[PDB]
Structures are given as structure tokens and as C-alpha cells.
mmCIF file of C-alpha atoms and ligand atoms in Angstrom:
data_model
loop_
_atom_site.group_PDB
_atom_site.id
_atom_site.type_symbol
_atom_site.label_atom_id
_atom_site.label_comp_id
_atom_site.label_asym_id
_atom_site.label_seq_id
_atom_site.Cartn_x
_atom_site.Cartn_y
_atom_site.Cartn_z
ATOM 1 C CA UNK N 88 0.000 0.000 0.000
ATOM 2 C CA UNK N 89 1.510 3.604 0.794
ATOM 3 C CA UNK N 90 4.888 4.638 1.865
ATOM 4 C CA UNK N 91 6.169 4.255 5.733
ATOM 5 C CA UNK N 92 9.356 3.271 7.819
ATOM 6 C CA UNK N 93 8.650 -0.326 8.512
ATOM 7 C CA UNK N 94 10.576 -3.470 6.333
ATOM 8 C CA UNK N 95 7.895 -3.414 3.052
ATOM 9 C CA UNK N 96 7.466 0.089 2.475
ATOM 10 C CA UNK N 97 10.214 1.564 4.094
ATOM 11 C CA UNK N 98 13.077 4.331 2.444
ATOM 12 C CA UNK N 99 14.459 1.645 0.106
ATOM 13 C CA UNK N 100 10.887 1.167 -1.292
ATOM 14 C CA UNK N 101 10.077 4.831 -2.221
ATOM 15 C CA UNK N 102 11.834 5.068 -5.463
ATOM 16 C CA UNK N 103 8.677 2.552 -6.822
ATOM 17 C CA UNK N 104 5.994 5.773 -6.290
ATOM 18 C CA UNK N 105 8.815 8.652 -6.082
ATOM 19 C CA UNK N 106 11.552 8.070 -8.632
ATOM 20 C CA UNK N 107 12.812 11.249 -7.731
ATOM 21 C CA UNK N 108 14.113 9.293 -5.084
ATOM 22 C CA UNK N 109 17.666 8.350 -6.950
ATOM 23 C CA UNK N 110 18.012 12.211 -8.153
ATOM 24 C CA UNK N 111 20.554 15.035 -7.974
ATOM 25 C CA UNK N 112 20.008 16.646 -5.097
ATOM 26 C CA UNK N 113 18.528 14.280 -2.103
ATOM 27 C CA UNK N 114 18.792 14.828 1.116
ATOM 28 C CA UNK N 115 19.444 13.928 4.349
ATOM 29 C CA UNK N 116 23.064 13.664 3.625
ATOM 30 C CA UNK N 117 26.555 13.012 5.729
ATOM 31 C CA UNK N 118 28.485 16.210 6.670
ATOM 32 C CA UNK N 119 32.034 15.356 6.790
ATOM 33 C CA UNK N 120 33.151 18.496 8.583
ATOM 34 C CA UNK N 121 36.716 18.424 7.225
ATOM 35 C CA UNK N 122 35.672 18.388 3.530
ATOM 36 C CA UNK N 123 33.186 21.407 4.218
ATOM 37 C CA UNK N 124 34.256 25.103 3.036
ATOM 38 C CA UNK N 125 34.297 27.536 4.869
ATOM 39 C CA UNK N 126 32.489 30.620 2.997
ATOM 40 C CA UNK N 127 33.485 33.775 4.850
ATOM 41 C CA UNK N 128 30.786 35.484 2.465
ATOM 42 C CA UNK N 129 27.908 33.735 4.194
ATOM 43 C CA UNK N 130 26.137 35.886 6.609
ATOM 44 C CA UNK N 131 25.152 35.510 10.008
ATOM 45 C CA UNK N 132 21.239 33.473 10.024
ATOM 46 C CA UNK N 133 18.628 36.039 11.398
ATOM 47 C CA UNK N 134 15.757 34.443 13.385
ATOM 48 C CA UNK N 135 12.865 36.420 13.746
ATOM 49 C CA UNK N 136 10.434 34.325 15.836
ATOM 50 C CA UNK N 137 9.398 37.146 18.803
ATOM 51 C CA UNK N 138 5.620 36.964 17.093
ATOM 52 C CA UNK N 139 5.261 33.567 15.946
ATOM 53 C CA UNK N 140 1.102 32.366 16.804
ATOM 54 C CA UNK N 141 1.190 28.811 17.674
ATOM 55 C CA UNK N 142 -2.112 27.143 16.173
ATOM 56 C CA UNK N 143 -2.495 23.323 16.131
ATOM 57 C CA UNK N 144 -0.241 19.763 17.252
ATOM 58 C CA UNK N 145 -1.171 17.273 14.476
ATOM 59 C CA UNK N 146 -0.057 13.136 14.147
ATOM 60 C CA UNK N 147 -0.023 13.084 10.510
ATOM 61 C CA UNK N 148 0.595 9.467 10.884
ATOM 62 C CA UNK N 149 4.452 10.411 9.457
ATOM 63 C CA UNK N 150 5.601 12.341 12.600
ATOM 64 C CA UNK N 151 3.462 15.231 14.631
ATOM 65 C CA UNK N 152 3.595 18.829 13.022
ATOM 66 C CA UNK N 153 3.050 22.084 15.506
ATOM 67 C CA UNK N 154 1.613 24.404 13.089
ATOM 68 C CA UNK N 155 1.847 28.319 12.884
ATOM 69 C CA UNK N 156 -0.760 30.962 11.234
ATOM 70 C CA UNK N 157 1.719 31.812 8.220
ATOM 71 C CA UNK N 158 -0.544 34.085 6.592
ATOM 72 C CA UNK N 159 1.564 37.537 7.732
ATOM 73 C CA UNK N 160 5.197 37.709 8.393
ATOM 74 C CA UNK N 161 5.268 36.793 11.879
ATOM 75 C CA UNK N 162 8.144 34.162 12.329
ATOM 76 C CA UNK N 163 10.524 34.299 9.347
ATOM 77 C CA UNK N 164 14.027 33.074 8.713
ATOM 78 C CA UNK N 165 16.438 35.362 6.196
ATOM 79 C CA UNK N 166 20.233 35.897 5.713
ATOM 80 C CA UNK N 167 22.403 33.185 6.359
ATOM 81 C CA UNK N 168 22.879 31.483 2.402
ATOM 82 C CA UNK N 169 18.990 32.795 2.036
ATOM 83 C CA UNK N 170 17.809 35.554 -0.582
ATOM 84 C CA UNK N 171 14.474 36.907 0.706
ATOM 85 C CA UNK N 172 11.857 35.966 3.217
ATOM 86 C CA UNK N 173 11.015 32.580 4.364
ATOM 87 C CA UNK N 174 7.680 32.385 6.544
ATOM 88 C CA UNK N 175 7.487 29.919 8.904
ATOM 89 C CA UNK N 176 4.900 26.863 8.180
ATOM 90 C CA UNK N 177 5.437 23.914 11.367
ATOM 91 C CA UNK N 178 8.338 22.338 12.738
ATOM 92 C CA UNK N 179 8.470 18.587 13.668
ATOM 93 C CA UNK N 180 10.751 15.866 14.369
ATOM 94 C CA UNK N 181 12.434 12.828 13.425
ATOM 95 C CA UNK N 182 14.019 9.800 16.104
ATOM 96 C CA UNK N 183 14.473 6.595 17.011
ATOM 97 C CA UNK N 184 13.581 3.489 19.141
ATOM 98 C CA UNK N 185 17.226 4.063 20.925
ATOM 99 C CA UNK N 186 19.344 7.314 21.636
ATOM 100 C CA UNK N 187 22.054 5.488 19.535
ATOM 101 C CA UNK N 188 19.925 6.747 16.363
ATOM 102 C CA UNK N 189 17.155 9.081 14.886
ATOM 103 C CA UNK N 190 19.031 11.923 13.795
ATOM 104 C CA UNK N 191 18.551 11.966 9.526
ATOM 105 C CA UNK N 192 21.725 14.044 8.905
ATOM 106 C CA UNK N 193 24.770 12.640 10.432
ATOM 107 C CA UNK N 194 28.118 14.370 11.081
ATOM 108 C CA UNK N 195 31.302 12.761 10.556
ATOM 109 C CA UNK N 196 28.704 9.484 10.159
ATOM 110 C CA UNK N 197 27.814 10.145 13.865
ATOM 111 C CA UNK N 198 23.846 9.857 14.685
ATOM 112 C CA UNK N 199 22.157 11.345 17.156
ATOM 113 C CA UNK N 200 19.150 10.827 19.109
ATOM 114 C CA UNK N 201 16.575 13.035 16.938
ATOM 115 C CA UNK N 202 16.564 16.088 14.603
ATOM 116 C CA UNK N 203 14.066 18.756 14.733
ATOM 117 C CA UNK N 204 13.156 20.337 11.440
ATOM 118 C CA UNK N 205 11.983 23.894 11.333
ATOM 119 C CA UNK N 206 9.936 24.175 8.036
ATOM 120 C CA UNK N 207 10.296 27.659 5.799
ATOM 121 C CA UNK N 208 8.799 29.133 2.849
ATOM 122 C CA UNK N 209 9.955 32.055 -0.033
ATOM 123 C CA UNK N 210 7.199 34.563 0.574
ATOM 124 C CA UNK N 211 8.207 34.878 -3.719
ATOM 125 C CA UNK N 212 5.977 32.282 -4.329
ATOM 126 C CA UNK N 213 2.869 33.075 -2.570
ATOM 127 C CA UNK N 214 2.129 29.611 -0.475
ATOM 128 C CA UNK N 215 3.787 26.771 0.462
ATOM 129 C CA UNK N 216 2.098 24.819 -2.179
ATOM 130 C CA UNK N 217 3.849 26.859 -4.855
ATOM 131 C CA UNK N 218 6.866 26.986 -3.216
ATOM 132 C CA UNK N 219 7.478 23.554 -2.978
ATOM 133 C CA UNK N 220 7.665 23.552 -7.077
ATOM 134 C CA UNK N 221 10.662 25.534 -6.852
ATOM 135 C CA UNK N 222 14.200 25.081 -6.509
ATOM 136 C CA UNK N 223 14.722 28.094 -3.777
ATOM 137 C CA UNK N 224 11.053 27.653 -2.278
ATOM 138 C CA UNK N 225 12.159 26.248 1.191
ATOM 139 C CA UNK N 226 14.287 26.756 3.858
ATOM 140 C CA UNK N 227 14.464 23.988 6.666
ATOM 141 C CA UNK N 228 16.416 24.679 9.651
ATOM 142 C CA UNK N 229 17.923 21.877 11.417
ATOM 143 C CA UNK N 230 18.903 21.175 14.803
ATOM 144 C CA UNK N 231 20.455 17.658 16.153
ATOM 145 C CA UNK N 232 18.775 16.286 19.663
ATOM 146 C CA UNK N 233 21.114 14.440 22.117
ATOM 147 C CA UNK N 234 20.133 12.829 25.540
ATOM 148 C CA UNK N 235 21.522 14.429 28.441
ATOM 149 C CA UNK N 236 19.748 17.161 30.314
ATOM 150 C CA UNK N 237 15.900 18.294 29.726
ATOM 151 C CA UNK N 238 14.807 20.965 27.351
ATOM 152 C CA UNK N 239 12.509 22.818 29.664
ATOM 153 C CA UNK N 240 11.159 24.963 26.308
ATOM 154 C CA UNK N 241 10.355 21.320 24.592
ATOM 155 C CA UNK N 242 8.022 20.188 27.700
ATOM 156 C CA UNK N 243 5.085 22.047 26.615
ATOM 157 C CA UNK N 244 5.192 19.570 23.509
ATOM 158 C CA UNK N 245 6.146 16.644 25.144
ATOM 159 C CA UNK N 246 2.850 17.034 27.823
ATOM 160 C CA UNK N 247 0.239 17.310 24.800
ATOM 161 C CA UNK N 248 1.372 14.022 23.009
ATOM 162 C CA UNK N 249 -1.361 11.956 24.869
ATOM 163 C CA UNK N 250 -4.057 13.283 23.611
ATOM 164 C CA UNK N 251 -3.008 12.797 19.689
ATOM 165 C CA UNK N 252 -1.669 9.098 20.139
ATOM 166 C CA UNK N 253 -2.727 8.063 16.935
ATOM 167 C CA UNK N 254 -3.078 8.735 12.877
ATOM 168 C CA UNK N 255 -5.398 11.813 12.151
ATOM 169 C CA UNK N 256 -5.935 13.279 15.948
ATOM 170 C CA UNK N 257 -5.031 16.479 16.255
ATOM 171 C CA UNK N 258 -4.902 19.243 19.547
ATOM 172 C CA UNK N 259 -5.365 23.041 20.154
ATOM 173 C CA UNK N 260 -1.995 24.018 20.354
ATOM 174 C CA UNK N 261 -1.474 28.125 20.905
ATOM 175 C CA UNK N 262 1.245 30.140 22.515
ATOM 176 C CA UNK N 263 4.078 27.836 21.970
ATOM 177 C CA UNK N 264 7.286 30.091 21.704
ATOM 178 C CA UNK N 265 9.603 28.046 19.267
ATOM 179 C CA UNK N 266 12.841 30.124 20.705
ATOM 180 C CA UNK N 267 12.973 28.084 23.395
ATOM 181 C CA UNK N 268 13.809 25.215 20.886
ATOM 182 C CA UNK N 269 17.233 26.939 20.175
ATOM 183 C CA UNK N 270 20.875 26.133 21.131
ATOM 184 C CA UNK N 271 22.805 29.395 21.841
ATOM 185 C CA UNK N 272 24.708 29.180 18.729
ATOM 186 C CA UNK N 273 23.761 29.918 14.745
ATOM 187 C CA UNK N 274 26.756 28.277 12.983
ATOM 188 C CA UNK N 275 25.772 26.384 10.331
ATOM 189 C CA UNK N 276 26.300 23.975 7.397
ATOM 190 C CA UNK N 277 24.741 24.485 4.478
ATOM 191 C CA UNK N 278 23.705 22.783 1.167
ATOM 192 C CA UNK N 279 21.090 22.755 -1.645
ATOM 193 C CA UNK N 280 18.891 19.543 -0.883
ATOM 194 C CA UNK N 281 15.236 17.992 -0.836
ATOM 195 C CA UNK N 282 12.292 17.042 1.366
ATOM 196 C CA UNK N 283 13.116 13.965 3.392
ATOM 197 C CA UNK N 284 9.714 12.460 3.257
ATOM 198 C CA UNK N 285 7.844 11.635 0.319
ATOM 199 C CA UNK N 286 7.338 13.564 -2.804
ATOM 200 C CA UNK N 287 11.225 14.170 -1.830
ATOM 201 C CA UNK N 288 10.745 17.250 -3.931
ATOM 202 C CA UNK N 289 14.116 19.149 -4.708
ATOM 203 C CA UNK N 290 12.990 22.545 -3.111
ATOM 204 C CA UNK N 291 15.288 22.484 0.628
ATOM 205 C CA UNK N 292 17.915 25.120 1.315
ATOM 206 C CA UNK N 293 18.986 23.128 4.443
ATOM 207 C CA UNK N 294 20.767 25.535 6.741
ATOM 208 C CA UNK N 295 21.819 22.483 9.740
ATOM 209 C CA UNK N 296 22.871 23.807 13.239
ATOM 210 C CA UNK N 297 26.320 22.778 14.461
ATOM 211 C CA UNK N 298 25.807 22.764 18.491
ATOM 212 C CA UNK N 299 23.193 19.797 19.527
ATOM 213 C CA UNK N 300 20.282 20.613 21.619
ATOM 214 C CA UNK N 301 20.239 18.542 24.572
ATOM 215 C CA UNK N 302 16.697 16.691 26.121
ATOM 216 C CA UNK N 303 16.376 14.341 28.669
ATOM 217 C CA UNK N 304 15.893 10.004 28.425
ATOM 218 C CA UNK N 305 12.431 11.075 29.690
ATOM 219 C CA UNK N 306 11.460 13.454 26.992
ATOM 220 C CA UNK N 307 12.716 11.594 24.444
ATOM 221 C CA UNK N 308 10.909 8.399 25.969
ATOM 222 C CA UNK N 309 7.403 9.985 25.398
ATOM 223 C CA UNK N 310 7.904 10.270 22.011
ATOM 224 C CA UNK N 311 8.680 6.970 21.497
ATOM 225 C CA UNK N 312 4.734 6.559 22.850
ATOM 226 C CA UNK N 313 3.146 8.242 19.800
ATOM 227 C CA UNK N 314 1.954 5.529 17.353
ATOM 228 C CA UNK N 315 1.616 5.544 13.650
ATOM 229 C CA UNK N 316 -1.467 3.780 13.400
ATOM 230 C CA UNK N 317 -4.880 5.215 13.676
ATOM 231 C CA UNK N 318 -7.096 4.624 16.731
ATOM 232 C CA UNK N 319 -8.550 1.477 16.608
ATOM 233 C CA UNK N 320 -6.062 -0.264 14.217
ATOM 234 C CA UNK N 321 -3.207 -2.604 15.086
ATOM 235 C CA UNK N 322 -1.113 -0.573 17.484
ATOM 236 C CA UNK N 323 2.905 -0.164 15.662
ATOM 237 C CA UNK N 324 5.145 2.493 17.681
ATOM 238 C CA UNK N 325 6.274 5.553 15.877
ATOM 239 C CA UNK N 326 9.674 4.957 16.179
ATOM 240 C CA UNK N 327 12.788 5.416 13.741
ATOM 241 C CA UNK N 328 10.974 7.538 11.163
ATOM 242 C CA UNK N 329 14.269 8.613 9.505
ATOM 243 C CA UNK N 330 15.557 8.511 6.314
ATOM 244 C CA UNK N 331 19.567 7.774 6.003
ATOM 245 C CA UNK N 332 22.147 9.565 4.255
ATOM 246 C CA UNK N 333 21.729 10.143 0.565
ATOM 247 C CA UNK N 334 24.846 10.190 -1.681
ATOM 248 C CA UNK N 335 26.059 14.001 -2.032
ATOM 249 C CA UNK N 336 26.784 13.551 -5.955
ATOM 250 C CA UNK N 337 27.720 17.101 -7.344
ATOM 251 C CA UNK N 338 27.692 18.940 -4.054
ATOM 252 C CA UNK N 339 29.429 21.067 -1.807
ATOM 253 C CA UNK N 340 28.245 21.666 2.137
ATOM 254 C CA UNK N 341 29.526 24.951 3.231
ATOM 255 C CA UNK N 342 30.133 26.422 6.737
ATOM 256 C CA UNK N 343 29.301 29.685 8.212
ATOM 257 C CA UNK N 344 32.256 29.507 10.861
ATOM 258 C CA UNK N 345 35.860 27.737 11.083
HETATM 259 N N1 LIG T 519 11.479 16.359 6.694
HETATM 260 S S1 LIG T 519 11.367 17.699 5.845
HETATM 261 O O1 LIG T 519 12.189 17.583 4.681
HETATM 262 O O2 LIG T 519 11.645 18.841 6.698
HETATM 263 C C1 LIG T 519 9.848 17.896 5.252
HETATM 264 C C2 LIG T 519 9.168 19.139 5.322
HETATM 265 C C3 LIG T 519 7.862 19.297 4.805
HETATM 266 C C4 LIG T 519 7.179 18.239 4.193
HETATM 267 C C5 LIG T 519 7.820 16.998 4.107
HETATM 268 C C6 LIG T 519 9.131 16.849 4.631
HETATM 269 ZN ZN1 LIG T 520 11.696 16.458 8.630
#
């Protein structure tokens, strides 16, 4: 039937429906941080997130999205490798059944316990719809999760997860502040990529954080809770819904710092 993370419809599966899959420019990828250029032309990432409006915590059956009203330029993302505006849409996660793995980029071929994915779009192109047909129309900003101390700005997510369990349920979810998903620093690596997910579509500016956010075994426990069925239906964990690195082909990752 339709594409997933378990052994018959898994990553290795979606070139069948998404041959797209094998292209160019895939992502997640490996960043081997001695290979990666430093651009001293890159400019610092600006973060504008002081009026982002929270609306809605979603399992999508995939992962669970916290969605923001982007219908006015109230949380946007610019500078950095970016020309313009990006708006942002959601931001979600990816991790595994153990804190050995979950993370979709890797660094050096090092994995770590989750990623979260902050999801942008070029206010060019009108909607994220559009924008997603275009090969500047997102920016995703990504920051690696280890195990280690709790998040306290990531418990307000963590305590909502029971009541959207399964496929399709979804939760009031206003006044989340998404700055207190940050690590102190912006330094980056950069590179031109895709959607990790199904239709893989080759839209991503991936701008990936180099210092780790760190949760606790507790935090990272509840979302290991979260199924991928629907209510009612055969109960399977959502756990390890991450792709693995994609060859880079005809790429270069750059860094913001040295
Ligand atoms: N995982 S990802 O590339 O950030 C992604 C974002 C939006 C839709 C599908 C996938
Ligand atoms: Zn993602």
C-alpha cells in the first residue's frame, strides 16, 4: 500500500511511487566536517520568531507537526545562504527506538538521538504549495537532539502528546514560543537539498545547526509513545521515522564559521 518506515514500504521502497528518489540533489546527507568550506561570504542566520502564533499539534501518521498561522510575516528566517523571506509553516521531528539513532543528517557518520526540522517558505511564491515547485522555495532549519539534560522549552510539547496518540488526531496548540527550541549558537552547514519524506521534492535550502540541543531520556521516551497507526487499528510504535544519508553527488556543504 503507501509509503512508511517499517521493512515493506520503508526508504528503500520509495523510489517505486517517487523516482525522484535516486536524483541530484537528495537529502538527508553526511556532513564530513573536514571536507566542508568555509564561505566567509555567508552571513550571520537572522531568526525572527518574537511573534510567531502557535495554532495546532497534528499526528499526521508520518511524525506530529506544531503548526503556525503563516498568513503575515510573523516568524521568518532570512540571511544566512537565504535571498528573501522565508515564513514559517510547522516544525516537527524525526528519532528513534534508541538514543544510539534518529538523527537523519549525520556528522562525521555520527547519529544522534533526533533532529528537529523547522519548516520555511519564499514569501516569492505566494504559499507553500507553490513553493514547494521551486528550486529556492524552502528553507528547513535543522537542529540535532542528544540525551543528556531536559529541554525545559520542549516540555510544553512533550505534555500534549497523549491526547493525539494516533493517525489523524489532532490538539489546540497556541502560545508555543519556538525560541525556546534553540541552542545558543547559529553556525551552520549548508547545502542545496530535498524534502526527506515523500514527494522528496528538490525545493530544501537546508541551513543544519552545528551545536546539539540537549533533552532528557524522559522526553525523548514519550515520544517513542506516539503511534503511527490510527485509533482502533493494530497498534505499531512511531519509532525510527528517519531517512539515512543520501549520496552528495555534485555537491558542496559549506560552513558559516571555522
Ligand atoms: N522532513 S522535511 O524535509 O523537513 C519535510 C518538510 C515538509 C514536508 C515533508 C518533509
Ligand atoms: Zn523532517
Amino acid at each position: 500500500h503507501h509509503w512508511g518506515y517499517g521493512k515493506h514500504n520503508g526508504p528503500e521502497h520509495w523510489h517505486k511511487d517517487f523516482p525522484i528518489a535516486k536524483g541530484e540533489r537528495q537529502s538527508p546527507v553526511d556532513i564530513d566536517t573536514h571536507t566542508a568550506k568555509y564561505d566567509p561570504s555567508l552571513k550571520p542566520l537572522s531568526v525572527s520568531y518574537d511573534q510567531a502564533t502557535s495554532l495546532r499539534i497534528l499526528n499526521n501518521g508520518h511524525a506530529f507537526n506544531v503548526e503556525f498561522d503563516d498568513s503575515q510575516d510573523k516568524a521568518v528566517l532570512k540571511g544566512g545562504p537565504l535571498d528573501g523571506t522565508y515564513r514559517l509553516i510547522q516544525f516537527h521531528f524525526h528519532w528513534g527506538s534508541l538514543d544510539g539513532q534518529g538523527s537523519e543528517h549525520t556528522v562525521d557518520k555520527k547519529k544522534y538521538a533526533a533532529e528537529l526540522h523547522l519548516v520555511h517558505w519564499n514569501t516569492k511564491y505566494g504559499d507553500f504549495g507553490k513553493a514547494v515547485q521551486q528550486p529556492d522555495g524552502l528553507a528547513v532549519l535543522g537542529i540535532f537532539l542528544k540525551v543528556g539534560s531536559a529541554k525545559p522549552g520542549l516540555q510544553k510539547v512533550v505534555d500534549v502528546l497523549d491526547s493525539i496518540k494516533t493517525k489523524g488526531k489532532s490538539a489546540d496548540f497556541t502560545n508555543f514560543d519556538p525560541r525556546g527550541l534553540l541552542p545558543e549558537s547559529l553556525d551552520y552547514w549548508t547545502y542545496p537539498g530535498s524534502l526527506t519524506t515523500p514527494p522528496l521534492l528538490e525545493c530544501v535550502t537546508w541551513i543544519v545547526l552545528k551545536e546539539p540541543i540537549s533533552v532528557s531520556s524522559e522526553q525523548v521516551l514519550k515520544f517513542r509513545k506516539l503511534n503511527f497507526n490510527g485509533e482502533g487499528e493494530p497498534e505499531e510504535l512511531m519509532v525510527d521515522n528517519w531517512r539515512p544519508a543520501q549520496p552528495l553527488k555534485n555537491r558542496q556543504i559549506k560552513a558559516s564559521f571555522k
